[PDB]
Amino acid sequence: MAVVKEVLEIAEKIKNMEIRGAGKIARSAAYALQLQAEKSKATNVDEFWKEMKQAAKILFETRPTAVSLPNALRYVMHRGKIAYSSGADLEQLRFVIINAAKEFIHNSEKALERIGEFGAKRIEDGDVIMTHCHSKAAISVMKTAWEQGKDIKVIVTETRPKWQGKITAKELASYGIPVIYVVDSAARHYMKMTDKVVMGADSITVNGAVINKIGTALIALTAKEHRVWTMIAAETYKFHPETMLGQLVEMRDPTEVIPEDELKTWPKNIEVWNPAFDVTPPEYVDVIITERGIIPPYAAIDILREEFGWALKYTEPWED
Amino acid sequence: AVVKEVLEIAEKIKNMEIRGAGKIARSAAYALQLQAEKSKATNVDEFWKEMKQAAKILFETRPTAVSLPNALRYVMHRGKIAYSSGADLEQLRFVIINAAKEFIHNSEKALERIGEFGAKRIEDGDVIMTHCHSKAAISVMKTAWEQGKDIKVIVTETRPKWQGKITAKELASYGIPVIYVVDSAARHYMKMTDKVVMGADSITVNGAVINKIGTALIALTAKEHRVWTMIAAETYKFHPETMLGIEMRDPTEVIPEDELKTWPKNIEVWNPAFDVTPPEYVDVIITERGIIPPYAAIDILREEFGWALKYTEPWED
């Protein structure tokens, strides 16, 4: 073990969750690799690649759950592993790893903006838009469309149990966008007057299925039933290599639904389940809006391939 | 030319003292009965037009109500049929009182009988999903279980007013295991649901179901999962009109007045009471006279309340 202090610190903040959010986390791990590369005591082209992998394993293990973390690492390590086994020199390999990370970081910092741009192109003047939860990426599409002078109205679903809809209603209204706040159970009733559906995603599966706050799949279902164009705004680093459509089907604190004081006063045979997400089938989603462009759900695997060097080779860049 | 025994009820109905689909329809019937058990009518002619007022009276107390005009249509139809065919005082006065009593009884045993029919469609081990707080739907659940059927109910929260808490506590008290979830979880758990049993506010001539907001979403994913879906609704909830192709409630029902004051002026809170569930998303409707296909609603209107295409209320010109 010969990893820099910088790296060890970043992983500490990640492992303890001092750094949260797909974007910030990914940006952090990429930057950690960048540090291990800039300030490295190495001397040969193998000692460097070795310690580079040493670092990536640590960062990786801070949170098995974290979705964007593994990808930021794969992004930087795949290009590195390719330049490496290409016979590249020491100072040569270092350069590769630094620009890969720096390019990742920059790309990520601009992620929310570019997604907004790409999604706004699919937003028309007079469009009534329905959304769910509190998604920065989705909100960025609506905001950009409004800043382009497009006259839109956003139907915000409450999003029980944590009510993320309130934050979304207030945030959107703050920019001056007309908002209609509604209970989740009303998504179908108003799908009849919705032109576009724009939601975010915790992660995307290899089949292009969408993992997001419960209710999401319900909205997508009725949107599909009404031929309402449905877009999912998500960064490339949220694309996941495994299946979840029939492999997962995370349970959260039951008290999020029924308050502690209230829950204890309830019968014993009544059980409160509070599932965090549901899985939206690829067929219920028209396109996924990423920082690199709009793509169809089933193109998810191409993203995993082109971006993070994924393949059934089933071996992580920092592995062998 | 109306008895106080009538306006006696109309008042409470018009003022909400007598509230409930069942009770309101029964009182309306009872009213039309008294005017037939305490009336000073010479012959059948002064008698009939004497009730057309009693019916029209109650009819205008709450045009909004659904079970209100059906109760009236029930008796009055069987009255105008005999009347027209020709009848005297004690001839028509009879068919009237007779019908009113039947309806009233048929109603008192409604929830009981609906549970009966519904239970027959419930199997041991059936996981059941429901919405809002329907006595009709709950009766079905409570009967299957009281027949020795091992059922487990998934109760949806049912925002904005949380009728789910009521349904959850009530069912658990009967000793029925309950699983409480937010409305948004309806699709997620539809995968492990066997039967969907919900109530109704009203039913349309096409067999469409008008019920608390969210009901159509559940029915939509039930159909997506080929889950047998039943709507427990008594005959007098059948409307002779179309609703497919809107009743906004108090916005503070969703966001409290004190909290809603803070919110920006460009944020409106919409609180629709119901949504409309298409007949194709409902397998059968459980009435107190049997189980029927949704689109059979038009037949119930004809048989039960004497509805015909070229129509005119049975208590008018």
Place this chain on the structure above:
Amino acid sequence: VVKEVLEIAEKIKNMEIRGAGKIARSAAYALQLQAEKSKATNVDEFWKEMKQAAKILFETRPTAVSLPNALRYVMHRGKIAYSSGADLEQLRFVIINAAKEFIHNSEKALERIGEFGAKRIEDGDVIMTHCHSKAAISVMKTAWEQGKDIKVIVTETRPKWQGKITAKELASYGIPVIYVVDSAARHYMKMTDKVVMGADSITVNGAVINKIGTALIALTAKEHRVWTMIAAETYKFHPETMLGQLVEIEMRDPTEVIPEDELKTWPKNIEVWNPAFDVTPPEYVDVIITERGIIPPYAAIDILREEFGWALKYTEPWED
């Protein structure tokens, strides 16, 4: 039969008078005169004068639908009376009476249909229509006159261009019109709230026979979940089926499509087919707007039975 009966039949055969309503009313009028002017001295002798009277009108244009219905309406009621041991005068009365009743109702049909349909039109509704249906237009004018702000998308309706007539007519009343070629029906179904069309005839199951193009529109309306209404008088309901033997209605003159001049400029191996109608399955029709009220398509048979005494098993009222 008398003379008036005969002089009306020719004005029907020679089609010197047409229009679902006009001929129906005229057919009923004839039977009325036969009743009002018959010199029959016997009841059974009178019943025979009516049967022959009707048989004569019926044979003028079997193809016509309203005709046999006007006769059925009047004759079914006459036949019933007769079988109850009704006298010469009671039957004459029953007939004359039924005839005038049918005539009156037919006279108020367009108006009543207009009223019934307008109740199903909301302020701000975009309505797509096809051909030039007096019944459909009546629904639109009536809604507009109730103060409802509507915009009507009028389909061109080749080959005879009825859309032009409808566009000019609706626009003349102040109703904003969008005129499009038939091929754009799907394209604009996305901004349509309601579809209102007429019918040449309705089948025993609620299937609609109307001007070529109608079924395509209804097809895409079903695809977009757009409330579809057919405006049609009760006497347009036929006891025939479309689920059984394959029946394709009249083929019209090719020159309606390609004029004679242009047509002799074409290669001989090109045939110009010009079907008048197509069939809309009852599954693509939400409601039919009749002068007696709104009904689901599967109630069509109820109209035939209760209104025209038709019976799957029974015979024609003026037969035997």
Place this chain on the structure above:
Amino acid sequence: EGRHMAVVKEVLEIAEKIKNMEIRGAGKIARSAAYALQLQAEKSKATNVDEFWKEMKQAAKILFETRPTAVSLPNALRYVMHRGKIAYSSGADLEQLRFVIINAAKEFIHNSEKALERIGEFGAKRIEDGDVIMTHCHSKAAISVMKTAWEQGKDIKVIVTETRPKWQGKITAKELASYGIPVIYVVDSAARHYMKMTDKVVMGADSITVNGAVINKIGTALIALTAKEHRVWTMIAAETYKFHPETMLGQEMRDPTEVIPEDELKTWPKNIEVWNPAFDVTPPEYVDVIITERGIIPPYAAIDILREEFGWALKYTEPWED
């Protein structure tokens, strides 16, 4: 000394004709743009791979900007440039790079020249003797599939839809009739009525979206909808360079007088607005296969064509962008 103009005159000349529209058609344009890049590579006076590559990118940029509405144009550019960008980045020298580019363009032009014939053959594999085929508008690719099947000895009858407002069906009817193919001319409204006696639907395309959706003349989607309703095998004949990386339109209202002649329309109350959309969008689910010069593929493989043929991927720049 090595004095010379960066972009060669031939390129500016070809670009001119495409800009002035002197050159038209998805094939001809794509062919001319590719040929320009070929000439640039054949006549460059550069003396080092870097300068050459730079001039190459200048050439493409000029061509790309002639018509941002022409769909085949940028794909001809991507085909040649993507392959040049690869050779270039891989450290190839002037000679090697010139060859790669010149060879790619020749390859692209040859494939385009043979595209109609090949689409014709791929489409015919799916046509059977006695088949009743329904078409729309006037598509050379689609017509090619029909003439090819008819020439393989397969008797077919073609139901030609009128295709208003511009009446392209008349052109299609006369043309098919001329090759000796029996034709049934019909109004657009009759599509569903005759879909029951139809075996195959073969239409063309103006462009194909990333999702495999089809952009074609108004009415195409309607026909496809009723074909699906009836399970009639539906094929869209389209060259690879018509595949686009965008969604839906990727951008059209034509002149009202195309539908209602001016002399008659000046007679109509302003109260009536004549809407004449050029295209409609056909969902990939109403299309069984797309017939390409490289073969038959399902609609959702459109993204594979973009990648393999035009080195397309989720990048921020085009192969000729710095």
Place this chain on the structure above:
Amino acid sequence: AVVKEVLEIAEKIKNMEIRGAGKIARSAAYALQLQAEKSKATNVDEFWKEMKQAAKILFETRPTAVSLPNALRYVMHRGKIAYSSGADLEQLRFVIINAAKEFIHNSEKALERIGEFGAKRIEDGDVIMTHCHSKAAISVMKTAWEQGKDIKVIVTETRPKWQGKITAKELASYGIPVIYVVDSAARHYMKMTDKVVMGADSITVNGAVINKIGTALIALTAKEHRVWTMIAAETYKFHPETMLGIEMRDPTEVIPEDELKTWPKNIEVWNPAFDVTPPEYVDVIITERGIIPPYAAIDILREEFGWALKYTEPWED
């Protein structure tokens, strides 16, 4: 007070000397005819009282028989109408006797009639895929062919009892081209099938069809390929209840006893007799009175067997 002949026919239906939807229906009806033709009653009320007794006894032989209750409903419905309208002994006796004859004659022309109605929907050059061995369905094919139509029939094996072999030879006998294949080949050959014609054991109140296992599978792929799917069934096979949302035959039908003895005990050979085909997967039902949409099944229960939202059968108090 039932007459000898009624107890005789009743016993044969109970011990099954009389089997089959048709024979059981015509027999039950004939029994009612006899009770009415030989009744020794002299009072209209005593007579009707007998008819109900005789009907109750006939109805209890094979409770689960489909057409049995309907044969009784047809006759007894027209009987309760005449009676309740105030008919005299002679008149009621005539109505019942007339209603039974009508039903029996109708049932005897059923196959012929169904065949004719179905054939109208069979174009020349059509390819038909069938299942099991249904006289009704085979009647449609035999008829179309007899009308001079060139059609080919694809016959599915129909495990476990190979009823397909019977249908094949039979059809072949008439000189109809036949294609025999395993059930599993349903979908693979759907692509070449113009129309699907199959029989039915019974039809539900929703228009769902109950028939030999596999029927619903064929109907599913048929709708997948949008092929016209017809179900040939007699009106008396329509039942007032819902099944969708059955009988388990002996495993020996699948794996012979001789061999099933070998197999490990941790294996179970399930052999259901029927499956439930959703009305959505069937276009029309071919009846002896006409071609109807599955959803029009309720109009047949009403129009033919006087079925309504009542609680009692025409022979019950």
Place this chain on the structure above:
Amino acid sequence: AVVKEVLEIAEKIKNMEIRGAGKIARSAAYALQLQAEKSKATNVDEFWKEMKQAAKILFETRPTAVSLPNALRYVMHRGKIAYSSGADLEQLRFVIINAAKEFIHNSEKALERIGEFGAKRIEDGDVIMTHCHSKAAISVMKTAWEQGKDIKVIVTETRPKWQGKITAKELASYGIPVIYVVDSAARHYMKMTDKVVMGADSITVNGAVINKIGTALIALTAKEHRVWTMIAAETYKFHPETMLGVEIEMRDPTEVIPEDELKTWPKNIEVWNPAFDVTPPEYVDVIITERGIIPPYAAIDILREEFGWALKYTEPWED
């Protein structure tokens, strides 16, 4: 200059002496391995020629088979990359030999791996339905059962050859509770099925599955009931062909109706015994290969990345 053992195995293969997807594959790979291990070439160029000739000799034996050519592509594609890159004689031999060995090893542990991956997607209590007799499919269930996961398996008879009996008996042995039911009952029991797992005779470039007749019907109903459906198949079963835009293989009619009984049937009757069903990729959630689970529409990527196939290129042993 084709080595002895090469013409040797190419004989066993063309003579059906050797049969099976895996076996004929590994065997074909091996052949190329010996050709490389015992070649008498002076330089690379002449050696490659020998390799390209030994390959074309194995290929021409059954030019329509599926596993075989994928075995050849696996080794030959890797050899061409080397050769093209300027690989010297010994190097190229090394690449060839080590590629044949990867292919053979990977192929020997194919079933274990597939069962290992498929098992990850099988939950405790799950009811699995299958068709025909698939070692790969069976391997998944067995692995799940041996994982402690309580599972029942509905086995479909699978006429006309009754492969269901074999599968029912086999799964029984491992101690797995089986439910035998005729083909016609697939839908009736899909209502209680949690997962569908079947095999494949091959996979097309578009992800469509070619398998024993009746396979498409089951996937059809499984799509209707939203039951997670899985197809277990070796990567070398992917075939660079399309079914999109005739009969695959008509088997002897006697498997359906015996000669003794058929001989008595009239001319009018004609029995058709298709061997395969074509299952659309839309009715298949994932394919289970020795390298992991993949969506059907990714079949083209397996052909490209595993066997180096590309529509615009020629087989690695051509020219």
